[PDB]
């Protein structure tokens, strides 16, 4: 309910289980392992959210027993790309868990992202991008925060993840603790590779 | 030389460049590339699991081609199972070239890590134990009826990814660097995600 | 009450505040910053424990407002060394917080240490040593697990800290997640420097 | 050259070896060595705060003597306060030689970190703001009535210890490596432990 998929082929199925935890059945990844999910809304409440990246049934940490994600056809996602395509900013107030095969997770929302006690579980790398993914010939090429003044805001209850965290936004505000192994933080209006290497920058004249 | 595949359908093709390149076997419908070996040892030059659909640049072995054993899909979990009585010695890095994946090494005879590590691996696991199958599907792992050791040597273990260490006993003389470390000792059975499902105790 | 100081000059004062959280007024450090505390019992319950390493009053995370530690005379501890001198093994089931000036914290208990949901807050380095500190001419020289078969046991709820964690014991058992930046783990019967570099080893003949 | 002490009782003695060695001032009864500067800039050779009671080997500056400004006690918190209008540029490592301590750099004019880091520092803090005193005791910090920037450059920031980053605004183009990172932006006042006590907002 805080997570509302886009209508087309890139909108994943969203359900909820006991406690309110939302379960996202991510869309079929391409052959490079990218599951490109599109949303009208992407907000995570205190009950948290689970990306079902599992090819067999099992036990998730936030949502109990889940079956396999029937959208996966012999390959799990290696990168779970979550892209908000409406004007609605994102509010992340609980944990997002990758259930099944560990993967990288990206949330892009050019309207703004606020993380207050948010977090990522079973993810090798996590990225919050106040910006858009860039595509060419249908392949992910990187990310853009060009022509954007919106904000990535880390609230008092902070952000908890493992491994690599990318924080990519025109502006970044913070009011608490950021738990991760390394943080790559890039402010300003820029374009980036898929690995968040900076490729170009837009500067006032 | 250090990595020797086993003769059957589940033996990958292995060559050197001393860095060894393993063209892992085709993954099954659960995303598992199940590779079996008579020996699995990584030297200082390291090893590369070729999980690539297009040619490209590997960190440890230079420029490599696609793995033709894959039929249009990369593996999701690369399972490397030693089926002989030979323990594993890991003295260099193991890299997944191509599409990142999880990797597991199972060797019920013992595993020694001394300067080993994992590259481009979302979650890596070292299991002094055996995988459990049922209907040809991976069900978990077993350290039952086993007293062998996972040993971490002076030069330690490094990965930027998630790490699980599973063995009847663990010895250590060095540093473990990982995004997250789960370690489980004793004689147990496990799910695929290393939840302990049962434990074996003396009378 | 789970923490019982030794009687002599190296026994710190222990009190409890709302919820049961214990507050340790660590003994005066020497000039090198080592506060050498000795205990008959060192057990931390789910309510947690706080080392008062503060030279001014302030707000602790686990125990509310605390006054300055009157044992400190113009210098806080740089290393809080907690040494169990009885035969009683330690059970750590909650967080240990350093209140005041951040410091290194060491618990040595040659009888055994079990950590099940234990953790360290505001510590630059944390060490659990199933072994004894070594002293010469009244100075800390390092640590010993010689002539010891006892166990460091990490339970299902795991261990959470920041930065460097040393796990030093004849045997180490584990059943869960160990959260830290790096873990230096040394099994066997050994002697170590103050920085946990191995100096010697005892091996069966 | 990059670090210039201020003329009074609270100006430390500063020399080079290009690595600069700062013999910080005597700590007060709350353990604070309060040092004031007309300039505080660290170059690629780095800087050393001498917090030692005995001679010994520093990582960045070779063999150094005890800091005679200490009267038998090392500092607990090393507070480095820029009192001029000059921003700080940190392009190398700052090391506490001797007894580990916390370190704070306050410069309300701006701080730029580009390859900077902290060694042997239990908790380090960069504050684009001023310390607050009351009765000559440190009470906290203030970023009020300030629009200046903490900027993290391409070469990033590294420490094995705890880190606080406090500024009206933070810009970044690189990686932060620390045991724990707390970051607080905006116009605020803080306690000594960086709990926000108040905030300044436009009408």
From Swiss-Prot, chains A, C:
This is Hemolysin. It comes from the Bacteria. It is found in: Cell outer membrane. The lineage of its organism: Bacteria, Pseudomonadati, Pseudomonadota, Gammaproteobacteria, Enterobacterales. Coiled coil: none annotated. The chain holds residues 30 to 234 of 1577 of the full protein. The conserved amphipathic domains in ShlA and HpmA may be responsible for pore formation. Bacterial hemolysins are exotoxins that attack blood cell membranes and cause cell rupture by mechanisms not clearly defined. Cell-bound hemolysin, which releases heme-iron from erythrocytes by interaction with the erythrocyte membrane. HpmA requires HpmB function.
